From TrEMBL:
Name of protein: Glycoside hydrolase family 57 N-terminal domain-containing protein
Family: Belongs to the glycosyl hydrolase 57 family.
Gene3D superfamilies listed in its UniProt record: Glycoside hydrolase 38, N terminal domain
Keyword Kinase: no
Source species of the chain: Aquifex aeolicus (strain VF5)
Pfam families in the record: Glyco_hydro_57
Keywords: Carbohydrate metabolism
Superkingdom as given in the UniProt entry: Bacteria
A single BP term in Gene Ontology: carbohydrate metabolic process
Keyword Zinc included in the entry's annotation: no
Residue ranges annotated for the Glycoside hydrolase family 57 N-terminal domain, each copy included: 6-397
Length: 476
């Protein structure tokens, strides 16, 4: 009797490329590509387990542009420059970026602490600020190759900075190929999402927010977004076919968000399986185990992720020692294994690139120990999405209705329902009436609405500039 364990690591970045200047206004795609997007599937080269991945199409587009040397990244241009050529504005944003990240374990260099305590910075100190910001985002693969330079910690030269940059782009250039390779080798399945990571249930029926939050105020949805919902899915299918050679049969719904209408749409578009959140299951079915494969109306398979296990990784274990965390995780899996007489399917689903920067050494001690330990347990069988979908010795249940929501509390309050977020929807509604091109789809991405109307943080205004620029461009 085995426990079937399914990791599904979700990778996404909204579009940082401002459409009038063509500049990437934030470097986060670059930094998560060099730190996470290659290295997360590259674990499969060293560990005999299965791991699965979601790549949003808008993320794939940006990885392609960086890989081809086409991305004009303003923050990265400031890193590349000789410090004598840095504008005051660029130094300021290098310092602000450092302060934003200063407390993360991946920024644990004594030299950073020295440079932040300094009133003015000379050329050598600026070179160190530039290069340490690069090295802070070093992924697992190059932490081996660049060991000598990482241990230096200070006194970097322009030549060493450029060496690091060249290696980082070599990683980005190999990234889509490793996803293709692990898929073809049967080491993992790869899914995608509707193109720009929108909330499909809201685009199909904005009144679905009242299934969970009856008291919320929403704007007057005087335009239909239903066709746009279909387009996000269809264009995702096309992009996925380009990279992987088939239409995708697995999708991750952005924010785990489902509704009866959204599930019907995924079925109509040929998606055979998706996953969503356990809170949605508990809101929809009184007596329900998350260890079963569910069939929504016998149209499409649904797995509900194990929220506690997913949250152990996403929220707890950064604060723990790696060995303690792995022993805890295996212990919980063993209790699950001993708790049912059938073979349970245990989905572990979370962002695949955001939690590691808060772990010691970018979470590499944790993941190496986790995967090493998993591959040794006879009673754990990790599965690809494809195996989880077709596995016969699993228990199964039909469900006829779900209560619309997301993996935030089972509701939509992070993206709609307060004055500020509603203003974004009103902007989008008005723009949609006058829309002339697919930039209106870019502006439907969930990310813009998440950041809007949130307590001020460094670089928040950049998401607002992006959103409004896409809205403007949509109408021209
Ligand atoms: O939009 C840019 C963003 O896009 C991607 O992220 C999206 C992701 O793909 C979706 O799945 C979804 O993610 C949900 C997530 O899975 C849930 O876990 C939850 O996330 C909440 C966190 O759990 C919770 O801890 C908290 O996070 C707070 C941090 O703990 C706190 O440290 C601080 O974080 C600041 C960062 O330290 C700083 O670096 C900067 O963050 C930038 C990112 O580093 C950068 O990569 C990018 O983010 C991408 C992301 O990588 C994609 O995968 O831009 C960020 C902004 O510049 O600034 C942070 C804020 O100051 O504060 C955070 C927030 O309070 O809250 C989060 C969010 O509630 O919910 C997610 C939403 O359901 O959505 C995300 C976003 O669209």
């Amino acid at each position: 009797k085995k426990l079937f364990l399914v990791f599904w690591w979700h990778m996404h970045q909204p579009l940082y490329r401002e459409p009038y200047t063509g500049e990437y206004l934030l470097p986060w795609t670059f930094f998560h590509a060099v730190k996470d997007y290659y290295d997360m599937p590259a674990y499969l080269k060293d560990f005999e387990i299965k791991l699965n991945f979601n790549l949003t199409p808008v993320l794939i587009d940006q990885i392609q542009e960086y890989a081809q040397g086409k991305a004009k990244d303003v923050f990265l241009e400031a890193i590349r420059k000789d410090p004598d050529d840095l504008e005051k504005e660029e130094v300021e944003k290098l310092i602000e970026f450092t302060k934003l990240n200063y407390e993360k374990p991946i920024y644990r260099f004594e030299r950073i602490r020295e440079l932040m305590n300094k009133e003015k910075l000379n050329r050598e100190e600026l070179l160190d600020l530039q290069t340490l910001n690069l090295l802070a985002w070093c992924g697992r693969t190059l932490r081996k190759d660049l060991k000598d330079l990482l241990n230096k910690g200070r006194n970097y030269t322009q030549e060493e900075k450029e060496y690091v940059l060249n290696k980082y782009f070599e990683i980005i250039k190999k990234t889509l190929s490793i996803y293709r390779e692990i898929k073809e080798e049967g080491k993992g399945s790869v899914s995608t999402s509707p193109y720009y990571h929108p909330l499909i249930p809201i685009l199909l029926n904005p009144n679905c927010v009242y299934e969970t939050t009856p008291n919320v105020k929403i704007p007057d949805f005087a335009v239909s977004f239903r066709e746009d919902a279909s387009k996000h899915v269809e264009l995702a299918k096309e992009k996925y076919f380009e990279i992987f050679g088939e239409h995708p049969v697995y999708m991750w719904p952005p924010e785990a968000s489902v509704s009866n209408e959204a599930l019907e749409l995924y079925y109509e578009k040929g998606i055979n399986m998706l996953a969503t959140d356990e809170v949605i299951l508990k809101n929809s079915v009184e007596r329900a185990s998350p260890y079963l494969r569910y069939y929504f109306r016998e149209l499409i398979s649904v797995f509900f992720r194990d929220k506690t296990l997913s949250d152990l990784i996403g929220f707890s274990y950064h604060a723990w020692n790696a060995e303690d965390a792995v022993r805890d995780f295996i212990g919980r899996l063993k209790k699950i294994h001993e708790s049912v007489d059938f073979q349970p399917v245990v989905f572990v689903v979370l962002d695949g690139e955001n939690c590691w920067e808060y772990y010691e050494e970018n979470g590499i001690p944790f993941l190496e120990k986790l995967y090493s330990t998993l591959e040794k347990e006879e009673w754990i069988e990790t599965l690809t999405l494809e195996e989880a979908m077709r596995k016969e010795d699993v228990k199964t249940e039909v469900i006829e209705s779900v209560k619309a929501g997301t993996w935030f509390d089972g509701n939509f309050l992070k993206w709609i329902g307060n004055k500020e977020k509603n203003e974004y929807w009103k902007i989008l509604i008005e723009a949609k009436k006058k829309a002339k091109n697919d930039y209106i789809l870019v502006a439907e991405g969930s990310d813009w609405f998440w950041w809007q109307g949130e307590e001020k943080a460094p670089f928040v205004e950049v998401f607002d500039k992006l959103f409004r620029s896409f809205v403007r461009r949509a109408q021209e």
